[PDB]
Amino acid sequence: MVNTVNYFKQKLKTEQQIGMWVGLADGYCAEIAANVGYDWLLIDGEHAPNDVRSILAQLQSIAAYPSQAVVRPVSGDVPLIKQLLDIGAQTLLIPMVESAEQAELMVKATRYPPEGIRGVGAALARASRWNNISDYLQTADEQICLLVQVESKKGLDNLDEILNVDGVDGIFIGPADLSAALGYRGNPGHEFVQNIIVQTIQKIRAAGKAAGILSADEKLAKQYLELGTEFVAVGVDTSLLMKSMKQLLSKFKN
Amino acid sequence: MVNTVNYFKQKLKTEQQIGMWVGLADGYCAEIAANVGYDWLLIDGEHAPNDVRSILAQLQSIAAYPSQAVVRPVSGDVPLIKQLLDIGAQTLLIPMVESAEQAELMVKATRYPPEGIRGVGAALARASRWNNISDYLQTADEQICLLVQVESKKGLDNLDEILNVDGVDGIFIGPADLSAALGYRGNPGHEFVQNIIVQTIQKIRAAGKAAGILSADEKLAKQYLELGTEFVAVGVDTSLLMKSMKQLLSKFKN
Amino acid sequence: MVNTVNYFKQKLKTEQQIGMWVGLADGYCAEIAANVGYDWLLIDGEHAPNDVRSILAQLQSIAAYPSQAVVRPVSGDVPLIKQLLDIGAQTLLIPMVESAEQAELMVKATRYPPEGIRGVGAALARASRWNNISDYLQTADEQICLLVQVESKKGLDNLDEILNVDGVDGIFIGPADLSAALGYRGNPGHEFVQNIIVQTIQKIRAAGKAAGILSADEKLAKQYLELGTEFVAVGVDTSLLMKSMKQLLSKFKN
Amino acid sequence: MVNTVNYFKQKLKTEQQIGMWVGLADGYCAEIAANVGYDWLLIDGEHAPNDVRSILAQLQSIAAYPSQAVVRPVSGDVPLIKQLLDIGAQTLLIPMVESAEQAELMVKATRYPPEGIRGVGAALARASRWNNISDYLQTADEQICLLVQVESKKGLDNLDEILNVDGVDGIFIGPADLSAALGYRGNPGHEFVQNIIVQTIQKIRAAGKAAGILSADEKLAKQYLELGTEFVAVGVDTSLLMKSMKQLLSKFKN
Amino acid sequence: MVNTVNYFKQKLKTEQQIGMWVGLADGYCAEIAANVGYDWLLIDGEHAPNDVRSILAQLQSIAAYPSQAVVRPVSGDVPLIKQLLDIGAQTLLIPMVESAEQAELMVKATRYPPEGIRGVGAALARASRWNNISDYLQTADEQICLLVQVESKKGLDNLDEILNVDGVDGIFIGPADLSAALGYRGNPGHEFVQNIIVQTIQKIRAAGKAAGILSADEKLAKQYLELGTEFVAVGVDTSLLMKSMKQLLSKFKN
Amino acid sequence: MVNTVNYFKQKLKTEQQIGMWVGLADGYCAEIAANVGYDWLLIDGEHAPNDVRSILAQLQSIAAYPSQAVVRPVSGDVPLIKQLLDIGAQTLLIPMVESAEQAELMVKATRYPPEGIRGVGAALARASRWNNISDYLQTADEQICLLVQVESKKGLDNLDEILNVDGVDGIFIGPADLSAALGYRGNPGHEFVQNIIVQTIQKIRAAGKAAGILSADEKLAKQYLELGTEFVAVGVDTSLLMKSMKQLLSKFKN
Ligand SMILES: [Ca+2]
Ligand SMILES: [Ca+2]
Ligand SMILES: [Zn+2]
Ligand SMILES: [Zn+2]
Ligand SMILES: [Zn+2]
Ligand SMILES: [Zn+2]
Ligand SMILES: [Zn+2]
Ligand SMILES: [Zn+2]
């Protein structure tokens, strides 16, 4: 067998990829999302009740479908990154990255020694298909994609420095965490926040990195796509489930 | 503690109850549905991948919310009905009931001896809260609601007989199974099917029983409500999740 | 490896075995019960939310301890009996046995062809330790113990006939189901019920079968032991958990 | 989306398919087996500790790989067949089929009304991808494959009659159950059993049906392939795991 | 919907709350404990085999009952605190707090930016009911209660400093960890330990914070209540299960 | 009950122990491995998808068999070590230990205060059998075995210092991580690597500590045993499953 090609990583340079947030934390729900035709699915280990084993079930579900899986760990924890790479997550979104030093550590966390600090256990890993991918340890690093979140004042204070880190493929802006950090909690739509987001996207693309964002607002998501943003998540499964059920009930009952 | 009042059963005589089908087969998804404010939630053990233990998790989720739980077993199996009553399901929807004899057996399956054949294990049952409901074995039968599905030609051939069975609280029409039985598989909207559904609802209500149905078609659901149908399910969680995600993607990609 | 000796089965002829009902339906709770030193533990598949897989977890827990596991299936279902034997349950308690014909079918359900109808899959079975017990298909039947419940009027109406069935090792009286069948639901302590229970125990032992019963009443359990009853369950884990927590809270408030 | 083509069903007429028995009862173990390149994988619900939900997890695992999934239910139970078809199992192996009447009922159990008795719930089914396969209810029946086991004297007594049932695609011989039924329990290699197996394979192929069998004996499996047997399972995952670990330990320790 | 009122937090200033430790690590066991009527239930993520997902199941169980849930994480880990708040834990008990600097970090970990560092993901959180609590990001912080454990010499060495931290609602004394730290492991009943516990409770209440403790000794628990201790846990579910089963068996054998 | 004797720890001084890596991450697969007769089984929490709860299930499986369980946590995390000790793991293998200071911290993490920093919760712990081991807090430390991995250049740079740490019972060499650290990723068989491994084993034994290693290469494993290496793992369950299934298929298909 040949290593699974990371099409998400390749497409960061060739097209704009439309994403769905997956927080229903279940292999059955993830499979429903995988049937829709999103370019990417974010399996959220930070803000949904997921662990390594529930994330594996969702990778196994999504694997039969063209949608590319991206996993967000709860934090930039090097041992947890090791675990998520070994179950076969090829794209990671690291929350709350705030320095070049932390971004460089996240690069090393995704690469085998001697250049990186990714722990070696290919005989045990779904990532290598338990060594049925016979050249895994030489081909693995090429198909790993590292995305970091800038979503704090300290992150913005270190943006130029993070954008200079080789091996950071993309910077994702987190509008909920960023608007809260800026004193606009629950109000990312404010001009003060939006002006910072737009300038940040422009800086990311000017440094030759992919820019990413989530907005469940159709008009903001389309504006971000017009700016050239490479990976845009346009909704959240928990939100779509709750809203569709509320909208339906409102046709019959107040 | 006093036995949990079955408000669904009481409301069969006083109002029209709006329902949501729950086929996502998970405690977390059931809790999302419970937050919307449906009169009833149908936990589907027939057409969703549920078992006694996954149904218990969903009863526990939904129990904190005013929505009334109804459980559909995979078939009119007396031992499975015993299990679903003991985990605390107070309303059951039995699929594919086709005779007065089968409906009578379903009544006995829901009632303690000596009148019925419900197995007795109150010390072990969530239904009795492990005997913290101190009079459970005396008060249980009063709060149990039995619904049967008529959804085959043999069911329609025994309708008057089923409507004469004391202890059947409601007859639910299954349009998917019934349209297939009638040779209109996937097309319940045909006049031949709809004329049979309407006369069936009229006969059910004329015999003083509650009539029920599911339609994800808003216009058909409202027409059934205009006929006086007592329990109308208006949608399905799996369908609402798939459709909302597809509708969203279509704003950005073909 | 040699087949696991069924000590419960041997002790039916040599001592009186004290039992605990296990309805907490979890491997961790079953292990706590296994540490106490009961002669037997009844893993309840009838009145607790258990399935084959949760029953397997509890057999694996209990296997490291001297307590002997007995499994109660939800009914005398031949395919379910096959499944419970293959995960390695050596003693089964079949509920609601009501005829010699049903008791004979339960005997065949526990024995390999050509004498019985137990399905053969030793390569897959924990029962054979996946054929690490090399003579399993020759030695299995010897260590299987079949107990049947008499707990209905029809059961009592066929008692002499059931007691004549070779391969029935023991008859267990179910006081909750029997008192309900007799029109004393929730009141097994009535003299009318107790006189029937005592005569039934006497008839079972006079036919050379083991008699069994459950009573959470210390005085009745001790009377049943005085009669020579071979397997007496003296409590239920769910009841002991609820009662101990209530008794503790009562020291500090209402 | 178009319905998933059943390549296993097509290949019954074009080639000999090599199979692996999957009894490790887990989505992670099933994925390991799916990586090897077997033509088919038998997910065993009869002799491994599987239920509908654990079988779904294994279908989701195997779905990303070319290996074709076949599911064996615990028995020819029509409601359980409904459940396994709705989670998306396209090929079923029914154990212990003993008459044309039972085989015809198994055909109806796999087909929608009005010709069959398969329950209709396409909005909820992984089988229809929750109606993302838009013509599922008209295209489903064509991709369903029904296999029945002949593995008892009564089965052999009704072989000509079962081979005349339209909609039975294949007859699988179960050597463990059959050798036990013939009084050769644990000894299927006896000439008396082997002569019956060979004649049975010849009769199955002479009636224009696919013949199938399992043998972990390489020489018998190759003899069955030389006879033209269309679907041959050549091993069992639990057996291969136990034997490989024993063989390795024997190199170091007695 | 309005945010769930934290009654435990309110009652720290108005009454003495009686608590039960929940370490059976299961939604079904947590529901049994929720039926008893304790003021609070401690779901133990430190000393019971719990994770975020098992803690969510127990919050869902307990949510239908008046008992208030308190969650103990394994350590004062900021990302784990984020996860437990988002699944809807409103009261946290942080083990082994040893400085005002650590206590201040725990305060920030429970509060949204810009004042705190709690990660923002309200669309995904059971805590916001997936934004069905429409003002959650404005009202959340008010209903969060932070308790810290002092249970080491360094903790006692920083007690006055921790008691000066705004946002610490309560200090819980851990007698097992503290008696071990003091060189009286397994013997918290020693006068040297008890005199330190009593002075600590007095200092906590003198600084206007709630004091808490666990003792399964009725006499010590009642003495702590006489001192005015605001939150007293009086037992542990695992201990009550083991002890009740042992006490019962002792009536019938050694 | 008396504390469970750690025979693995005792045998470090008396024999050479043969081990199997267990990475199938399931109680059922662990039980299969437990039946073979390995001296020790390594439950891998670092490179297999395990968590505290899945590791508990595997300890419960393995506990009925003479094989000794060793648990590898994902990292030298003090709170995770606390959790794994409380579920009853008596031998721990800590990955990537790189200094005497870290090794000393790992010793304290495994010992109760006042000498160590192991959190005290014996009423809740399977390790104490919920205090059914009445002297657990006095006898626990004696039966705990700490193994550390040296598998990086920094580890080798601090080897003499680590070998001087009292309470380190054994040093395990990780050839996959070490060969990668040395610039021979996927090629531990190189003379440069093997000469370092051999001198490392010699230094470990010269300092009176047990030496350990894993090699799935029979010739290297036997050479390590000839050097006197005290604990040698000779294979990996995932590898043996994949290889045995591939070897079997190759007899029938290319
Ligand atoms: Ca199950
Ligand atoms: Ca978990
Ligand atoms: Zn964020
Ligand atoms: Zn229907
Ligand atoms: Zn009974
Ligand atoms: Zn068979
Ligand atoms: Zn403590
Ligand atoms: Zn390593």
Residue numbers in the entry:
A (entry chain A), B (entry chain C), C (entry chain B), D (entry chain A), E (entry chain B), F (entry chain C): 1 to 254
Copy the relevant paper text.
Here, we investigated a new Class II metal aldolase from the p-hydroxyphenylacetate degradation pathway in Acinetobacter baumannii, 4-hydroxy-2-keto-heptane-1,7-dioate aldolase (AbHpaI), which has various properties suitable for biocatalysis, including stereoselectivity/stereospecificity, broad aldehyde utilization, thermostability, and solvent tolerance. For Class II metal aldolases, the enzyme uses a divalent metal ion (M2+) as a cofactor for substrate binding and stabilization of an enolate intermediate, which allows the reaction to proceed through C-C bond formation or cleavage. Each protomer contains eight β/α motifs of a TIM barrel fold with an additional α-helix (residues 6–11; N-helix) at the N-terminus. Three protomers are associated in a tight trimeric structure to generate three catalytic pockets, and the trimer is dimerized to form a stable and rigid hexamer with 35% buried area.
Notably, the use of Zn2+ by AbHpaI as a native cofactor is distinct from other enzymes in this class. Zn2+ binds to AbHpaI in an octahedral coordination with six chelating atoms consisting of the pyruvate core, Glu151, Asp177, and two water molecules (WA and WS1), so does the geometry of Co2+, Mn2+, and Mg2+, which differs from Zn2+ tetrahedral coordination commonly found in aldolase and nonaldolase enzymes. Notably, Glu151 and Asp177 in the Zn2+, Co2+, or Mn2+ complexes were more rigid than those of apo-AbHpaI, as reflected by temperature factors (B-factors) of the crystal structure. AbHpaI has three and sevenfold greater affinity for Zn2+ binding over Co2+ and Mn2+, respectively, while the Kd of Mg2+ and Ca2+ to AbHpaI could not be determined. The Tm values of AbHpaI were enhanced by 5.7, 3.4, and 1.7 °C upon binding to Zn2+, Co2+, and Mn2+, respectively. Consequently, the result suggested that Zn2+ enhances the thermostability of AbHpaI, the highest among all types of AbHpaI•M2+ enzymes. Zn2+ binding can enhance stereoselectivity in aldol reactions and enzyme thermostability.
